[PDB]
Amino acid sequence: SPNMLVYRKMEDVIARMQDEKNGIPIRTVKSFLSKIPSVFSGSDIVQWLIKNLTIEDPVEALHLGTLMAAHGYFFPISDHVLTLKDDGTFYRFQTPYFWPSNCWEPENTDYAVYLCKRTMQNKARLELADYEAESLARLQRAFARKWEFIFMQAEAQAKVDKKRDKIERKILDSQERAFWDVHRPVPGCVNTTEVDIKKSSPPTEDELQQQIKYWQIQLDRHRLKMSKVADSLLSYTEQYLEYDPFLLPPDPSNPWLSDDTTFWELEASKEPSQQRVKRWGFGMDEALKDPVGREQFLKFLESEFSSENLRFWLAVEDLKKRPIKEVPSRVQEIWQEFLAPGAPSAINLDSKSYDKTTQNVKEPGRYTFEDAQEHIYKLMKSDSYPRFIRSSAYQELLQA
């Protein structure tokens, strides 16, 4: 049931169309030439949808309507391209037997029977369509030996249908051309019956202890108040409004709006702009994202003679960006240079952090110093990075 969810929501609308108190009235029309029974105008639906569904945009109402028509629910009375047009064209519903939600998939031995029926009717004109006749020639070529039985069934259906009424013989014969038109569409129209290939395919006490450990996990997890969570989202969003190209245009102009390629060149330049420098101080993560930020931050620390921590920081991800073939040798190089005793770039770790990496160095891996990664990350975010903001070099670049 791939499409059954949307088929069960177009049918709910159809039932609302058909209601007598507040639905679309059905009328019989005659204009000085003939009598057309039980039809409704095309402009009836489009004005209906805007009211009940509150579709303010008139194109949206006409787009929703033409998808219902294209799927086989109401059809043009005298056309082979199912659509909805906002004029006086006459449309008519579809019988619930032929609805697409009934799991229909007809064969080619049942199309020919319908196609041979049309030639028998009105045998002085051969009323058909250009593509229908081409198919009729093709089907007879293939179904050669059994063609007699396809033609034999066509005779029986023709004579049986002859003994009927006249009003009923026209309605019940248009709603068998709005079924083969949906299922065998005119060339150049999308086939709505296609589907995606992804979607075409003991004791009772042990259960309790699994549930008990299941509940405690949720209790263990920490949660915040919706008042605080909402503040974080709005504060973050309002902090970047001036940075969104969709809601505050760039300087000089959008490359996709005015063909001004200079915007990418300015951003990729080696000299950060005034807007760039302001984004630097929003957070330490923002500064490290910019490759220019990494160099400037490191340049301050080496002048301060405290860059040994940054050199350890950048080294870990470089190991993670390295293919597995070189990790056993890369882990030892970082081991000796930074956190081994007597290292030229010795750094200080917590006892618990040092214990885990001491027992894990024996088995090299990409995630060996993750705990040291977090420990160094936290201390920069509290002390080192705020110092860089207070540093005179930061404000001098801010104003220019």
Binding site: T119, K123, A124, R125, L126, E127, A129, A133, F149, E155
Partner: protein, 296 residues
């Protein structure tokens, strides 16, 4: 003297000489279709059915050769024997052949192939050539008794006072063999209203449907002009009106049907008859009134 209208000798010889070429390139093409006789296009429309259009058009180039040689009796009768006998054998077989391309396709849903080439398309042409031939015998036999009494069948007309000429009179039977040639082509317009969909190999049922739409339009003008602007007219202007109609109507037709064919590409079948009505009975009640919301 100078009591007669003047005539040209270059502007007049350039018509009987340009038409003696379209009458030779219409007889040479009758020996090209026979010598080939075997092609994917010439075998479709048989020689017996195609070569009677390249011989029927040979009689439609005469109404201008007579209109140059001199006016008299037997040249005013021969001018009507060669317009009705060359119309019912050209556009009377491009209409019984646009009628076959409808009744051989409805016969492919079975196995009969009823219309043979010279059997049901040429035996229906002997009936058209029997009403057009009974009429002409009656007409040329009633204007032979009337020529005895007063009417010479050739009259005179006057333009620009002292300028006289001899013309061939238009009688009241000529207004009627111009509605018979226009109602008959209305059958060749309906017959191409029902063949716009039939799948054809060489698109011949479409190059013969523009040769019929041509004449219902382009020959209803030549008759109206020839009937109103007739008493005054001229002697060298009538020759041009005929030449501008027998090259823009009949030459375009033997070109629309000739060159595109050289260049452009017991009880067992009784019970099943009953059960197949049971299926169309059970299937019919599902849609007939079962919650259809249109029938009630």
């Amino acid at each position: 003297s100078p009591c007669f209208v003047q005539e040209d000798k270059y502007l007049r010889l350039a018509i009987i000489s340009f038409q003696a070429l379209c009458m030779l390139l219409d007889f040479v093409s009758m020996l090209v279709v026979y010598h080939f006789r075997k092609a994917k296009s010439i075998r479709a429309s048989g020689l017996i059915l195609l070569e009677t259009i390249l011989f029927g058009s040979l009689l439609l180039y005469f109404p201008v050769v007579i209109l140059y040689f001199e006016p008299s009796t037997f040249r005013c009768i021969l001018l009507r024997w060669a317009r009705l006998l060359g119309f019912a054998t050209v556009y009377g077989t491009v209409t019984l052949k646009l009628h076959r391309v409808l009744k051989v396709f409805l016969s492919r849903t079975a196995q009969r192939i009823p219309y043979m080439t010279g059997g049901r398309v040429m035996r229906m042409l002997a009936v058209i050539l029997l009403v057009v031939f009974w009429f002409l015998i009656g007409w040329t036999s009633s204007v032979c008794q009337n020529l005895e009494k007063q009417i010479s069948l050739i009259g005179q007309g006057k333009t620009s006072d002292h300028l006289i000429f001899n013309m061939c009179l238009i009688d009241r039977w000529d207004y009627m063999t111009a509605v018979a040639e226009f109602l008959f082509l209305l059958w060749g317009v309906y017959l191409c209203y029902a063949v716009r969909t039939v799948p054809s190999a060489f698109h011949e049922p479409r190059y013969m449907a523009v040769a019929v739409h041509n004449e219902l339009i382009i020959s209803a003008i030549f008759h109206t002009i020839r009937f109103v602007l007739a008493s005054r007219l001229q002697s060298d202007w009538m020759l041009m009106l005929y030449f501008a109609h027998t090259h823009l109507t009949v030459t375009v037709t033997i070109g629309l049907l000739l060159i595109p064919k050289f260049s452009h590409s017991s009880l067992d079948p009784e019970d099943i008859r009953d059960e197949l009505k049971k299926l169309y009975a059970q299937l019919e009640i599902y849609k007939r009134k079962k919650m259809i919301t249109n029938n009630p």
